[PDB]
Design a binder for these strands. Structure first.
Ligand SMILES: Nc1ncnc2c1ncn2[C@@H]1O[C@H](COP(=O)(O)OP(=O)(O)OP(=O)(O)O)[C@@H](O)[C@H]1O
Ligand SMILES: Nc1ncnc2c1ncn2[C@@H]1O[C@H](COP(=O)(O)OP(=O)(O)OP(=O)(O)O)[C@@H](O)[C@H]1O
Ligand SMILES: Nc1ncnc2c1ncn2[C@@H]1O[C@H](COP(=O)(O)OP(=O)(O)OP(=O)(O)O)[C@@H](O)[C@H]1O
Ligand SMILES: Nc1ncnc2c1ncn2[C@@H]1O[C@H](COP(=O)(O)OP(=O)(O)OP(=O)(O)O)[C@@H](O)[C@H]1O
Ligand SMILES: [Ca+2]
Ligand SMILES: [Ca+2]
Ligand SMILES: [Ca+2]
Ligand SMILES: [Ca+2]
Ligand SMILES: [Ca+2]
Ligand SMILES: [Ca+2]
Ligand SMILES: [Ca+2]
Ligand SMILES: [Ca+2]
Ligand SMILES: [Ca+2]
Ligand SMILES: [Ca+2]
Ligand SMILES: [Ca+2]
Ligand SMILES: [Ca+2]
Lengths: 311, 311, 311, 311, 311, 311
DNA sequence: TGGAGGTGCATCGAGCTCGC
DNA sequence: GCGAGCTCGATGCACCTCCA
């Protein structure tokens, strides 16, 4: 997919400058074409004279102009949709989780956010014709609730070898919000060498709830969170992966809305509101989407991952 | 297990700065690697220049990058599971109370929350092959309901010398929520010198119900509680201990949910709902877990701690 | 026992600030050590700068850190247990009413709640070797059912001079729930000058049943009751007295549970359920306790207080 | 006895505010001292600032602190006990009906509840040395069964002038439960101008049996009844009158208990169970009391009120 | 006597609201003054704002406060007592059947309950000086045992024109318990236009014995019966009529008590127990009364109604 | 006479609901007007909303309000009285057996109860001017003692064609008490199509003596019997038939009273006590009646039914 | 530049004779 | 001249701030 940053050295850029770009987090020509002038001036060995030269060269390698809605409609027909393991959720999402966008799943506790992320971490490795993305999975966990035993159960359901499923899931544990963002720079490096199909941040806001406390730190909290969601969108456009983040809820005391404020509400393309039903059954509702009508669907958390209820 | 903070003085940090870290609550290199930039700037003799130097040095001592799910699945096979004294609860928990996570036990009065905490305080000292954790226990009591006589009864059941069992249980009585948190900083110091296997906070929310009263203080209450649960998670990752907190219930008037709100619901990895059965028998239900199916099991409070019912 | 608050003026606190503490209800160094930052900021002439200075000084006078369960087991062997006048209840309670905790006695009418409180008000003045507490008694009555003639009958049974027994029983009549709480601040002042062994609130919930009426006031009712039970626990830790509260019942229409809800159920360390037997005989059952098995015992209300049945 | 509310205008309260208190039912300084903050905020022209000022001023006029059981034992020796006309009932009650408390008389029909209330309405006017209370009587009838002809017969027995006996009995007929409570506010006004010794509510629960019907209204019924019994206790503490209420029975179908539930059982200090004997003779039994042993006594309904049986 | 409800429209109530009251069964100002807030909220076009306005206006038209027993003794001297046709029963009842109260007559079959009700239905039309009530009679029959031929025989005895006696007896046949109560609302309407002196319900409990069968319906039976007896008491206070109800007996198998339970025993002011003597002679006994001693009297059922025995 | 239930479909009721009423036993508008709300809720396809609509519509078709005793005296002059075949019994009953009421005939064996029922079954078919009812007869026999040969003998006495007399007597044999009641629902259906004048239940209590045995089943026995007698009264008001039931006797061992207890004694309007005289002559005595004096009369059982004795 | 759930209450209603 | 036991049903209640 994306073009390696080494193509800039052929097009008239010194390899010493390309090295300076890679240490700033740019491992692809697209990542440079998508960056403003500011993000290149901040690098040490890069001046404004080298910036326009770098951007001009990257601009003719990546198409960054106007195009017809007809052409864009053809490219969106080839977008992959990853099955959620539930036949009912796939009808609600009209195919499954969409790559190249940020999908947010929120709900109270035990609503299935970590279980959907575990099912997706396996179903993203299925062939395209089986509803997968035919790529690896990367799981950034911020709570310590990542259980490879759940992956092995989903892998048994689809007849995949559990040993190979675990080998194609990159796992990282974030311990603060700075580490959570620093993990994304390493994610860009890994998405260049091997093909990934899914990026999970579970949860994307849990650490923001305590690294920044009180209204006095509310602004800096939302600024840092907004930068985090921008690099996620960047990873989605750069590598065409599906970004699935998990969010937490808060009570309205004045009946539960997701945390993160307006930053995460605007940034998330699709938002899924998970609520508990009866027993193991749970209800997902389209809370926000550009193309999906507001509807509900009922799924279940079985011993083999997310699936459909028995009745 | 965890590496002492003194290893930073070898790696290029002034011992005067390490002293300043230890007075802020950092007694391990992991505790520094897991902390953001903010928590280090707040210390007096630490500037931003020393912060990145401190974090960079701690970052190469602790692995804080990506890894395969296969490697993580091997480390989770070595996790210890502490027996609850009941053969039925151990099947429900598929082994017992899991270290490195926060387990919440809630229920109405006399449901056995303090009795399970007393049984765990002894069974955490058993050898690994007997279902224990082979370490000391630390009991933070916020109600005054800690009874060493119950420990001696559990110790007689497992053939341990009651005099040595009491010597391996550190006990503290918290009197307010500020003291409850201040006790955790002393807990980190004690977990460095000797090996602990279990940390009990009974109850973790009782003092929040009255130190903060009314909706006008609801936000500050949940903020303080959220910070408390973060340092608990920190103690679990730093020292690999099992954190077992106890929670209280409230009636729904509109049939009893645990207090603490969404903060403690999201933070708790496993939640056990204890309800009363017949006589001395009581029923535990998996209320939340990443890997455990929602099921019930019946245990009993006998004269020798928590065990199985006679029938 | 407890250290007078005047010891803070020696340790570096201005006597004008100590005066401001005493008008807020703090008459002992322990009462200040046990209080959070919030309760000190609310006092007028106390700022945050004086708060940490006050708390730091009080923290080195009162041990508020960790200790071994062995040391705590020695201190609990010296705890006093006050005889209930009945040889059968003392076996059920394994000694009698325990000091330093809150014991709740509930039941329907005429079940003996006021009679046990009258027997305890005398037996708390016996020497330790006779089953007493060797201290005064304080009786907060909220119904007007305090009868010194019953004290004189219990005093004749134990050979005490009735004139001195009545002189060692402080009596107050509470008329509303605000007065009931305001009476506890005067109780702390009186527990400093002379040694008390027992504090009776009969009944602790009767006035809450009518000062707050309906579900619309249910929250404020339980908040006020919870604050009341916290200052009771404070009086028990500060002065090591036995707190014996009396509770009322309500019918389950859907066969009688105590009122007060989950607030008083969690707060009470020991709960005794009194029910009527035959004639003058009545049955007490351990309804909740950290160390006592659920069992029953039969006592009697004779002409000389609570005692054992004739058969 | 009680101090008029006009004493507050001398102590620093505006007479316009005192007027606002009197229209809320407060005609005595004691009635204000005994009221919580809530009952004063509900009055229109009273804010929280005026509330504490009103309560603080009333608090130094009425002793509302601790006292010795010795002092309380002296005040209870001066309590008046009103003769019931029967020499046998006076031995059972150890003197007669006690002022300052609520006495409940219940039984099936024709058991003598209305006849005892008629005898008491006359004997409460006797001099103290003859067993009376030396005050007027107030009779709140809720059934229409008040017969002044019975008062004239009791008056002839004690040699009192029947014309003056009827002049010292205030009579009111209540038609619903709201009217029954509204009558107590007028009772407080009348107890200030002239001295009363007895307040009769016959029957206190008859109208509750039909103004509130079914389990769906059971809660509101018991709430309203509980408020009624609180204002009765208030009238007993404020004016030191004897409150004698009459209650009805219900069959246990599963052998007759009084109606009203646990509300009236806890609130009543003394409960007398009247049952029919032979002919005109009837049996009273102490059903509940703080100081009276459970015993029985036989009385008779003669042509001159309640008296002793011929044999 | 009673004031028409139209007087409220003069005192500041909209005639549309008065119309809404009349369709709820309120045809008199007294009927509104005697009703609680609840009974007015249940009407459709009546809100709480209109309720207090309606009750306040009705409260100053009807005296509903305290009064002296002397004044009440004068009003009870003017109460009418209706002759029972028997000189012996009138001495037993000290005048006859008393208006403004509920008199219950019970006994086994053929004991004369329907015959006394037929004699009363005529004697209530006699002038006052002849022992009557000088008003019409209303006879609610629930058995079909109403015989105008018996009225004509009683009318011949007192020299009244039988054609006019039958014109002054309103007759209704009730077929179920709902119809029995619905008939009382029409009774209130008829008591406003013309003056009535007597209301007969024969029998008041016969239909309750079969519309509600078994213990499973016992509660609803007694609730419905209690509401019926309340509207009877209301008709007695509103219109000053004599309410004479008839009751049935049941055998004690463990020697015959009246049915209806404690509801009808408490509600009935006077209860007459009729038993069979010799031949046509029968014995009435005062079974319950506020002012009448328990005594017996012998009457007879002759060809001209209830009278005295020949010997 | 009675209006068919089909008139409700014209007045605004769905014919599907009318069908549901007819399967519950309601075949006439009167039967619905006479039923309470409860009896309509028990039907499946009938809700409370349809109940009031059904009852309101039936209420304006049947007059169910008050009326004058004069009007009721005219309707009772048109009541039919069926001759008993004996000139002496007709003078005792002042005309004969009265329609629209329940007449009970009891006595020991061979006293003529079954013979009077056979004579009535024929004389009820005579023209009105001959002392009959001009309608059919329905005979519910519970013993097997129905003999059409006795009807033919009575038919010969009155000159009726025996073949037509037997065609106008509907006969049913009841085998248990449930069947005895189930037969009455079919009786209501048959009374709608053709006009009946008499309903005989011989005997109404014989099967109750053995379907329910012992005191343990006494309550359920009397409940079932009471329901049976209510549907009989319903058939009498609905169709204006004469209900003649037969009862059995029991010895008083402590000289023979009828069985059935107080249920059948109250329910029966008229009770005839038959005793044996000399030879074929027997004596009937008015045992209970609203309008008939207690007197005796002598009749005879001849070869042609019940008649007068020869002397 | 959004953030944070809390808290139980209230009992009622009697019915049904049988067997020399 | 004396001994005999069994029977269940029902429901509705609201209010509470503060945060750099
Ligand atoms: N093997 C299993 N079989 C069935 N159900 C399971 C299994 N493992 C976990 N569950 C259930 O999955 C549910 C959802 O848990 P999950 O980890 O998805 O919660 P969550 O939404 O991430 O919550 P939180 O906010 O606490 O992190 C839990 O209720 C748990 O009982
Ligand atoms: N003058 C009198 N002489 C003797 N006995 C009388 C006299 N007046 C009333 N009694 C008796 O007093 C008894 C008790 O009646 P009372 O009014 O006290 O009943 P009660 O307990 O209030 O009943 P209820 O629940 O029906 O109101 C009755 O049995 C009545 O016969
Ligand atoms: N004209 C009359 N002359 C004499 N006695 C008569 C006359 N009419 C009726 N009686 C008698 O009146 C008595 C009482 O009958 P009544 O109708 O009053 O009974 P009851 O108490 O209502 O009975 P039940 O419970 O059956 O309805 C009967 O015994 C009857 O014989
Ligand atoms: N054809 C007849 N001629 C004369 N007498 C007859 C004739 N048939 C029957 N009897 C007499 O009629 C009398 C009454 O019998 P019946 O059937 O009426 O009794 P019963 O009261 O129903 O008795 P049981 O309680 O036994 O059923 C009997 O004594 C019988 O001898
Ligand atoms: Ca999770
Ligand atoms: Ca506990
Ligand atoms: Ca959780
Ligand atoms: Ca008490
Ligand atoms: Ca407790
Ligand atoms: Ca009475
Ligand atoms: Ca009481
Ligand atoms: Ca009758
Ligand atoms: Ca009565
Ligand atoms: Ca026979
Ligand atoms: Ca027969
Ligand atoms: Ca009858």
């Amino acid at each position: 997919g994306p073009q390696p940053i080494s193509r800039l050295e052929q097009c008239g850029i010194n390899a010493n400058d390309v090295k300076k770009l890679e240490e700033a987090g740019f491992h692809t020509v697209e990542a440079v074409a998508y960056a403003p002038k500011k993000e290149l001036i901040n690098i040490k060995g890069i001046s404004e004279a080298k910036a326009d030269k770098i951007l001009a060269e990257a601009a003719k390698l990546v198409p960054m102009g106007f195009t017809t809605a007809t052409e864009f409609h053809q490219r969106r027909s080839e977008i992959i949709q990853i099955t959620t393991g539930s036949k009912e959720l796939d009808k609600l999402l009209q195919g499954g989780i969409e790559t190249g966008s940020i999908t947010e799943m929120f709900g109270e506790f035990r609503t299935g956010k970590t279980q959907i992320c575990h099912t997706l971490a396996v179903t993203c490795q299925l062939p395209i014709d089986r509803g997968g993305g035919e790529g690896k999975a990367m799981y950034i966990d911020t709570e310590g609730t990542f259980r490879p035993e759940r992956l092995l159960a989903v892998a048994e359901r689809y007849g995949l070898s559990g040993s190979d499923v675990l080998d194609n899931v990159a796992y990282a544990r974030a311990f603060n919000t700075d580490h959570q963002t620093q993990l994304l720079y390493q994610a860009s490096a890994m998405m260049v060498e091997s093909r990934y199909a899914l990026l999970i941040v579970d949860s994307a806001t849990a650490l923001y709830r305590t690294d920044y406390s009180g209204r006095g730190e509310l602004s800096a909290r939302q600024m840092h969170l907004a930068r985090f969601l921008r690099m996620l969108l960047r990873l989605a456009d750069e590598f065409g992966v599906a970004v699935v983040i998990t969010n937490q809820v808060v009570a309205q005391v004045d009946p539960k809305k997701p945390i993160g404020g307006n930053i995460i509400a605007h940034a998330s393309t699709t938002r899924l509101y998970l609520r508990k039903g009866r027993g193991e059954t749970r209800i997902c509702k389209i809370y926000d989407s550009p193309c999906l009508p507001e509807a509900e669907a009922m799924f279940a958390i079985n011993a083999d991952g997310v699936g459909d209820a028995k009745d």
